Structures are given as C-alpha cells and as structure tokens.
Design a protein around this ligand. Structure first.
Ligand SMILES: NC(=O)c1ccc[n+]([C@@H]2O[C@H](COP(=O)([O-])OP(=O)(O)OC[C@H]3O[C@@H](n4cnc5c(N)ncnc54)[C@H](OP(=O)(O)O)[C@@H]3O)[C@@H](O)[C@H]2O)c1
Ligand SMILES: NC(=O)c1ccc[n+]([C@@H]2O[C@H](COP(=O)([O-])OP(=O)(O)OC[C@H]3O[C@@H](n4cnc5c(N)ncnc54)[C@H](OP(=O)(O)O)[C@@H]3O)[C@@H](O)[C@H]2O)c1
Ligand SMILES: NC(=O)c1ccc[n+]([C@@H]2O[C@H](COP(=O)([O-])OP(=O)(O)OC[C@H]3O[C@@H](n4cnc5c(N)ncnc54)[C@H](OP(=O)(O)O)[C@@H]3O)[C@@H](O)[C@H]2O)c1
Ligand SMILES: NC(=O)c1ccc[n+]([C@@H]2O[C@H](COP(=O)([O-])OP(=O)(O)OC[C@H]3O[C@@H](n4cnc5c(N)ncnc54)[C@H](OP(=O)(O)O)[C@@H]3O)[C@@H](O)[C@H]2O)c1
Ligand SMILES: Cc1cc(O)c2c(c1)C(=O)c1cc(O)cc(O)c1C2=O
Ligand SMILES: Cc1cc(O)c2c(c1)C(=O)c1cc(O)cc(O)c1C2=O
Ligand SMILES: Cc1cc(O)c2c(c1)C(=O)c1cc(O)cc(O)c1C2=O
Ligand SMILES: Cc1cc(O)c2c(c1)C(=O)c1cc(O)cc(O)c1C2=O
Lengths: 264, 260, 261, 260
C-alpha cells in the first residue's frame, strides 16, 4: 500500500518524433515528455513551432532538442537519427508522423502529385522505420502514422492519399517480424478527423457539401462523426501513442489502431 | 488525475476469479478502481482476487452469477451498483473454448459455447449499458481466432467470438447516447488453464509434445519469443477503460505480441 | 464457343429459396444447369412458382418444407434431397431474418429468434451439407455488409448474427477440405426484397418520414453505380463461387453491394 | 448474351507475355474479348500469347510499353484504342517481387518495386479510366501478403500491394461517374517464375529443397492440397470483368484456395 501505481512512464527513455513542430506530432512529442521521455523534435519548415514544443517539454520537467530534417531525403533521415543518438546517448522510441494530404479525382492526378505524396507519406516513413531499427536500443518502439482513410472510410477523390497510408498498414505487420530480432515492437495509429492545420486545409473535401460551409461549421459537422459528439484532437492520438510506446503496450505488436472516437 | 488511473471509478469483470479476468480485476484495482469480482464456479479464487485488490489499497467484492442466465446478469449488475453506489466500467471476460470438426459438432456443444461466449456477453453489455454512469466503458472479449487465425476444428469457438467483433462496432453507436465507449480485446495464446487445456489443438501434432514443450513452442509464435500472459491483456484493458483511451471506440484490439 | 460456369449434372439445395435472394439463387443455378431443391418454411405457393420457373428453363426442381431453426428438420431436408436427386453437390445457406433495436431494448426472445435461424441454423445447414455433399462440392453461407463493412445504429443483434458466419466460413474451409468442398459466404448490401422493404426506414436517416418507394430510390445512391442491389446481383456471385472455375475462392466472404458507401 | 462471355469487348492486360497476365489474356480471349497483350521485356512470349488468342478464334495484338514510364502507359492506351477502336476492360497485372530485412532495403530497391507495383499500377488505372467506355472494368493486382499473410523480410513488396487495396476502394467511387467497376485480385502462391524465384523465402530452411520440392510443399498451404495456377486467377478476373460481376465493386478478392 506504500506504493501508488503510476502506469505507462517513459523515464530514462529517449523518443524521436518526425514532424513534431505542429499538429499530431507536436501533441505526441509533448505527451512523451509528460510521461518522462527526453524528446527529439523534428521539423522541415516550422522552426518557430518546433521551438515552442521543445520549450513546452522542458517546462513540464523533461529535456528536448529540435533537429531540422526533410524526411523525403534518406540522407537527412540518416543524419536526424545519427544526431539524435549523438545528443542523448541512445534512442528507445521512434514515431514516424510527418505527412501531407492530397485530394484529386483519379483522372486529374499527376506524376508530380503522386511523387509529392508518396515520397513523404510512404517512402519517407519506410526509411524513418529503417533508420529507427538501425539506431534503437533492444526493447524499443517504432510507431508509424496511417489514417482511417486506408481501410475504414472511402472518401471520393482521396485515392492517392488513401493508398499512401494503406502501404503503411502492410509495412507495420511485416516490420514487427523483422524488428523482433531486437525485441522492438512496431505499430501504426490511424487517426480519424483530428483538428490540426491539415484538418482545416481539407475539411471541405470530407463533408458532403463542404465548400458551401465555413471552417468553424465544417469542424462542428465533423464532431457528429463520432457517437461521442466531439472532434478528435491531437492529444486523443498522442494518448494512444503513449500507451503503445510504454513497457505495458508490448503485447500490441504489428497492429494498426484506428483512433477516431468510433466515427461513422 | 494521474494519467492512466481509475481513482473514484467502479469496475465489474465477469469470470475474474481466475485467468485473464483475475489479471484484469487486479490491474483495475492497482489503477485505483473498486472492483466487483464475478465468478460462477470459483468462489475461493474470487475471494483471493478480492483480498489481493484490498491489499494493494482499493476495495472489491465477489458476486456469484452464472452469466449464461440473463436473470443472474441483471442481479449481478443490480448488486454491484447497490454495493458500490455506481458502476463506470464493465468487462465481459467469461468464456469457454471448444474444438471439433464441423461434422462432429452437436446441438448441445453449439449451445454450451454460444450461451456463454456470445449470448452471455451480449446481455452483459445490455445490463452494463443500463447501469453504467455517463462517460463509462464496456469491454468485451473476442479472440485472434475470430478473424486473424484460421485453426482447423475451431469453427464453433471462432464464430462465437466473430459475433462479438460485430457487436462492439454497433454497441459503440448505441452506447454513445451515454458517452460510453465499447471495445473488444482479442487475445492470442495467453497462459491460463484454457491455454493448457487446448494448446495440443493449436500446435501441429500437439498431442505428440508435453505441456511445457507446447508452451515453449507457442512462445516462438511471437517475434518477441515469449508467451502472452494475463497481465499483457490486463494492461490493454486498463488503457481502454482509462480517460486516456476514450478515442479508441468501437474497435477490436488484437493483443498477441504480433503472433504468426 | 466456350460456355463458362455451367452446373450440368450437379444438384443444388438453397435454404429459403421460395422468395427474395434465395429464389434468385435457385433460378440462377437452374439456368446454369443444376437441378435444385427449393426449401421453404412458410411460403409453399412462392416455392412452387420457383420450381415451375426452373422446370420451364429446362432443369428439374422440387420444393421441400423444412424450418431450418430445427436441426432435425435440417437433417430431414438433406436426407430428402439426396433421396430424390441421388446426390448433392451444392448447398446454399440463405434463410435469415432481420432485427432492429437499441441494445437496451433487446430481449432474450428477440436474441433467440435471430440467432436460432441466422447463426445456429446456418451452422447446422453447413454441418449436414458437409455430411451429404459429393467430394468437390460447394457450401455457401449468407452474411451481410452489416457484419464488418457498415455500422448501422440499433442493428447490433443482426450484425453479430452475421459476423459469426464470417468466422465460420474461414474455419469450415479448413475442415471441409478433407472432401475438397470449398466454403464461402456472400455478404449482400441493400438488395430489393421483402426484407429490404420491411426495414429500409431503419437504414436511411429519418427513414420513417419517407415512402417505401422513396426509401428504395435513396438506397440506390449508396452505390457509385447509382442503382439498387437486386437478388440477381447476389445470385450471379453465388453462381461463380459454386462453379468449377470458382474453386480457388475458398474460405472467403465476398461483399456484394455495388461499392456502397 | 451468353452468361459470363465478353463478346464484342476489348481488353488490355499489362505484363501478359507470361505468368498470370498471359493466363488472364488467353482467358479473356476464350470468353470472346479482343486482347491487347502488353510486355516490356518478353516480345517472343507476347507473340505466342497473341497467336494462342487468334488460334482460339478471337483477335489480339502485342504492344511494348514499360509501365514504370507514365508516357509509355499513355502511348499503350492510345495505341490500344487506335487499333481496336475502343477499350472496355483494363487489367493492371505487371509486378516484381522483393525480399530483404527492413535494415537491408536500399533507396534503389524501394524505387524498383514501388515504381512498377504501386506507381505504375496507379497510372495504368488513370489511363484506363481516361480511355475506357462507360460500363467498363478496371482490375488491379494485389497479393495475400498485403493483409492476410505476414512473411518475414517481405515488407517492401507487401506495402507495394497494400497501397493497391486502398486505391481500388476509392477508385470505385471516382470511376462510378463512367459506371466503371474497379476491383483487385490478391493471389496467393501461384505457379509462375515469381513463385519459383522466392518459394525458398516462404519455407523454413527453404534454400535446402529443390524447386519442384518447394512447389510440392506449397501445395499443402491449401486445404484442397494443390498449388494455385495462373488459370485459377484468370477465371476470377473473367467473372469480375463480365456483366455478371458488376455488383462486386471496390473489393479485393483473395484467390489462394483457402491457404493457411
Ligand atoms: N489531421 C487529421 O485529421 C489526420 C487524419 C489521419 C491521419 N493524419 C496523419 O497524421 C499525421 C500528422 O497530421 P497533422 O494533422 O498533424 O498534419 P499537419 O498539421 O499538416 O502537420 C504536418 C507535419 O508534418 C511535418 N512535415 C511536413 N513535411 C515534412 C518533411 N518534408 N519532412 C519532415 N516533416 C515534415 C510538418 O513539419 P513542418 O511544418 O516543419 O514542415 C508538420 O509538423 C500525418 O501523417 C497525417 O497524414 C492526420
Ligand atoms: N487464454 C487464451 O489463450 C485466450 C485467447 C483468446 C481469448 N481468450 C478469451 O479470454 C477470456 C478468458 O479466458 P481465460 O483464459 O482466462 O479462460 P479460463 O482460464 O478458462 O477462465 C475462464 C473464466 O470464465 C469464467 N466462467 C466460466 N463459466 C462461467 C459462467 N457460466 N458464468 C460466469 N463466468 C464464467 C470462469 O469462472 P468460474 O471458474 O467461476 O467458472 C473463469 O473466470 C475468454 O472469453 C476466452 O475465450 C483466451
Ligand atoms: N435484402 C437485403 O438487403 C439483405 C442484405 C444483406 C443480407 N441479407 C440476407 O440474405 C438472406 C435472404 O434475405 P432476403 O432479403 O431474401 O430475405 P426475405 O425477403 O425476408 O426472404 C427470407 C427467406 O428466408 C426464408 N425463411 C425464413 N424463415 C425460415 C425458416 N425458419 N426456415 C427456412 N427458411 C426460412 C423465407 O422462406 P419462407 O417465406 O418460406 O419462410 C424466405 O425465403 C438473409 O440471410 C438476409 O439476412 C439480405
Ligand atoms: N505467387 C504469385 O505468382 C503471385 C502472388 C501474388 C501476387 N502476384 C502478382 O501477380 C502479378 C503477376 O505476377 P506473376 O507471377 O505472373 O509474375 P511474373 O511471372 O514474374 O511475371 C511478371 C510480369 O510482369 C511484367 N513486367 C515486368 N516489368 C514490367 C514493366 N516494366 N512493364 C510492363 N510489364 C512488366 C512481365 O513482362 P516482361 O517479361 O515483358 O517484362 C511479366 O509479364 C504481379 O503483380 C505479382 O505481384 C503474384
Ligand atoms: C469527418 C472528417 C473531417 C476531416 O476534416 C478529416 C477527416 C474526417 C479524416 O478522416 C482525415 C483523415 C486524414 O488522414 C487526414 C485528414 O486531414 C482528415 C480530415 O481532415
Ligand atoms: C499458439 C497458441 C497456443 C494456444 O494454446 C492458444 C492460442 C495460440 C490461441 O490463439 C488461443 C485463442 C483463444 O481464444 C483461446 C485459446 O485457448 C487459445 C490457445 O490456447
Ligand atoms: C441503404 C440500405 C437500405 C436497406 O433497406 C438495407 C441495407 C442498406 C442493408 O445493407 C441491408 C443488409 C441486410 O443484411 C438486410 C437488409 O434488410 C438490409 C436493408 O434492408
Ligand atoms: C505458400 C507460398 C509459396 C510461395 O512461393 C509464394 C506464396 C505462398 C505467396 O503468397 C506469394 C505472394 C506473392 O504476392 C508473390 C509471390 O511470389 C508469392 C510466392 O512465391
């Protein structure tokens, strides 16, 4: 009785999160800090935001650094991971989060748009996993980021993006087998509509007559997707990531968790 | 509010005198919940789980109820709420395993399995919905045999759990009117007396090996080269029934260490 | 000139083939050359119309009354089928009932009404099919796009009754391989039948506020092909699965809903 | 109209000089389609397929196009329509396999696989949609490794095909504006040079055994105790691309004989 159980702590662990200056990655980075991890905050374009995330993690009593790395470029992924281990001594947790959204009828999709989406969402994530396996401590954690659009929800004009995430679901199942030789688990989270810069950029494409409504209105209509009648927020996703990368999440391995509040 | 804790909440777990249910009950108590430990046949083991939850500093009571009988399910939930004043979390765990070729399955055997595994769980969820506080949690128990793994001579049991996977998806819609989340956990091979009872039927030529050899060979199913244990399942249930698990709703989480 | 997918010299049994999807399946298998056992429990005149259409097409059929909630009636149905045609190659488990209600309102009686036919009934139709079929035969079971693909409010009991079927067919394919029998399910979307008309109000948002005909027209927009599902759509897939050419689809649930959203 | 026939239709199959593509091409011709036989490397095999289809009484032409190159996909579809006047059915079949632990996968190997299996298939679907008559058919080619079977060291290929499963579901929505259905076939182990190239990677100590011995062992994956053959896949494609297949739309059909 002299012990109150504190579940899911990451004290003594080092995490890296791709694209953690903003949106879901930021909330993952802060949540892992809150749980006791030291955090490598990665950005490509948003150093102002990355600084605020670093400051937020230091403020709640952990440590953090920001490292610029364009995760479309494999040489920059190698450097990101090399710099992470040089700075903190080790790496236990890698969360592949960076991504871009796209909308377009099949007939209008160009080579350039296909390559813009796959280079980050699919190829970038793959090589983030590759470098994570190669740098992680035994018993570590790899997380990849999919979407409820890969399998559960079928949105018109969303083929390119949906396919970029469907690849991820397949990678994590096989990666769990390969990464077993270091006792590293590999899982994905597949968020539903989560209120971020990305959400506001494209919510008109998910709502039936979306272009005809205001952003605030589209957010309210998205809140009725869930039988809980609220939006998904970045912290909702971060909480699941925190469970999977904890010691206690070990027996969830090679799985894609859909985190959408039960959306219809 | 410590993240992941259940302080001030009340939980009920069917079949928590032993196996996975016992691990779930102790874990929810460890997280700060008061626990109703249901048993049908194992009163002594149930009291030991109660005494363990009290020793780690929470409260618990054992209530006898055969969850094949819907009137006993109603009475179990009525007595839970009467004792602790409220219920926030209901975990439907009780189940039985069965093996046999389609051609050999009797009406008696179909009824034995579906009455507990499927009908029983359905009416546990029904009484949970009716008794639970707003913002509460329902967990049902499936199996990685429902969808992920196709074992010969396992059709009755696999189908009994496949029904659960469908129930949770729709239950999340119905139960949203009380902001209750509904999920299932689908364990893989988890070391309990159920596991040891049928490990021969899951290992190729399993009758040919010893019980310890069957457990070692199951260990290699996971890329992590260990068996699943009741605690592994309990930890996932604990997360789902916490405030922090709210955005997992209407899902089946397969908890098998990445088994092949 | 190659004629694919024929069933000449084969014998098929379809449960609940007097009306709706079952009737379309029975007529389709007859058109492809199978002799057909038309099962009914309550609709003898409907069943005789189906037998008459199959004979008109150039095949042979009989109607056999059997309530497939009752395992003894299932045993008799299969014994009578083999006694009459000499053999059985194809068993299609189709009989079902729909149900709607919030979890909180579902009674023991309604749970038992639905599972006894939809789940237990189908299970024992498969059992007696395995025991009576020729080597190299076919079992088809009927699921629903509501088991996994769509999640409809107040539809838990029915959706679960069909999710059990999906698990059964996967494991049945293993057990039934020792007679080279393949086992699959079809999972229809909204298919225009008596059942469809009975419950379309519960699938369409504020369905009670529209006519049965209006509800049908609204369901036609679920598919990107902008038409309803019909019994024939489902019969066509069952016909491919029970053909020689369908052999390499085994242990699968095929969702047949025209791509519905 | 004869049930299941394609009289008066024109089909195009990528990679139809050999393997599964060749069986698809001959099967669509046997059913009454005129067939465009695409190859990139196998002109003499493509001509043998063309001569087979002419011999059974249909018409065919072989067209060289590397479907890694989107401008060559455009030209393939342009030349198909210019030759037969129309296109009704497009089967995206070309693919390559890859094995390697995640730690060993290069940029060059990722691009080799995704450029053909994922990007190439996507742009074949794009050009099919732009060239097809209303009421047409697109088929893409996945694998049972994308979802059903998790083979070690198979991540790059499995992911290449997992993208396909997502493409077909959304393509079915976009292509509905021309009443074109879009489906994938996901073969299991199917006896071709691809099968033989990696059957050692799907068997423990596989590198020991002979190729014929590995094929005999694979035949026991199915409860039907035979291998899958290209014809097994071609018959499913023939059904999906027929008038009678219309109500299967946006789906991935796993065609593996019930493999475990
Ligand atoms: N929001 C949703 O509803 C939703 C739903 C399902 C899935 N997702 C997925 O969840 C993940 C995050 O989404 P979000 O909503 O947070 O997106 P967001 O708000 O758009 O943020 C995108 C993040 O990705 C980073 N990023 C972009 N390009 C990068 C590059 N080349 N290299 C490294 N990092 C890069 C950005 O960093 P910089 O600003 O520094 O470039 C930014 O941190 C994505 O993978 C997305 O596909 C989101
Ligand atoms: N172990 C595995 O590998 C595995 C894998 C997948 C799924 N599961 C599932 O996980 C759940 C628990 O399995 P387990 O391994 O812990 O099995 P177990 O050790 O056999 O325990 C069975 C539990 O069910 C209870 N129970 C049995 N009949 C009951 C009744 N009529 N009313 C109320 N409770 C009843 C038992 O209580 P009494 O002794 O008091 O009867 C006992 O607590 C089951 O639903 C099982 O199907 C287990
Ligand atoms: N229509 C849809 O949208 C849809 C969608 C998905 C799945 N399904 C499923 O497809 C199957 C056929 O549905 P439907 O639309 O054709 O339904 P229906 O129009 O309601 O016809 C029901 C059939 O089931 C027979 N039946 C009922 N009780 C029976 C019993 N005790 N024993 C034997 N047969 C019995 C009926 O024969 P009697 O009249 O002789 O009793 C009748 O032929 C069902 O399993 C249904 O769940 C339908
Ligand atoms: N067990 C299996 O066989 C199996 C299982 C699951 C899925 N699959 C899939 O089924 C499909 C066919 O496989 P298969 O077994 O028949 O393989 P295969 O025997 O190796 O045949 C490969 C085919 O792809 C064509 N191809 C290769 N590169 C090409 C390019 N750049 N442009 C156009 N075409 C090209 C080849 O033509 P050229 O010789 O002219 O280059 C050949 O026709 C593939 O998508 C594969 O992933 C196969
Ligand atoms: C109801 C709804 C509204 C949205 O704005 C999104 C989504 C859902 C959604 O599922 C989604 C998934 C995704 O991978 C990226 C997104 O930007 C999204 C969204 O933006
Ligand atoms: C490799 C292995 C060995 C086993 O004994 C089991 C399993 C797997 C398994 O998946 C399983 C599922 C289940 O629902 C009940 C069980 O008793 C089990 C098992 O017993
Ligand atoms: C849009 C829509 C309208 C309907 O009437 C049904 C359905 C869908 C549907 O999916 C369905 C499934 C089923 O198993 C039985 C039904 O009666 C149905 C339906 O009746
Ligand atoms: C039992 C078995 C043996 C094999 O050789 C293969 C497979 C299965 C298999 O599934 C497979 C899938 C695939 O997409 C490509 C392949 O070359 C294959 C295979 O080669």
């Amino acid at each position: 009785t002299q012990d109150l159980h504190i579940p899911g702590r990451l004290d003594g662990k080092v995490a890296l999160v791709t694209g953690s200056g903003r949106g879901i990655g930021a909330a993952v980075a802060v949540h892992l800090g809150l749980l006791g991890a030291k955090v490598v905050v990665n950005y490509a374009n948003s150093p102002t935001h990355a600084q605020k995330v670093v400051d937020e993690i230091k403020q709640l009593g952990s440590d953090a650094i920001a490292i610029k790395a364009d995760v479309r470029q494999v040489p920059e992924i190698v450097r990101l991971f090399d710099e992470a281990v040089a700075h903190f001594g080790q790496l236990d947790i890698a969360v592949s989060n960076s991504g871009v959204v796209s909308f377009g009828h099949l007939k209008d999709v160009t080579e350039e748009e296909f390559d813009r989406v796959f280079s980050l969402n699919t190829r970038g994530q793959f090589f983030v996993a590759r470098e994570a396996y190669k740098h992680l401590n035994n018993g570590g954690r790899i997380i990849m980021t999919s979407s409820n659009t890969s399998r559960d929800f079928s949105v018109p004009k969303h083929s390119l993006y949906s396919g970029s995430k469907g690849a991820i679901d397949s990678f994590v199942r096989i990666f769990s087998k390969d990464c077993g030789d270091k006792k590293i688990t590999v899982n994905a989270v597949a968020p539903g509509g989560t209120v971020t810069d990305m959400f506001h950029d494209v919510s008109q494409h998910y709502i039936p007559n979306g272009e005809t409504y205001t952003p605030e209105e589209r957010q309210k209509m998205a809140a009725h997707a869930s039988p809980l009648h609220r939006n998904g927020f970045p912290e909702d996703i971060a909480r699941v990531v925190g469970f999977l990368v904890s010691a206690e999440g070990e027996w969830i391995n090679g799985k894609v968790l859909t985190v959408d509040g039960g959306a219809a």
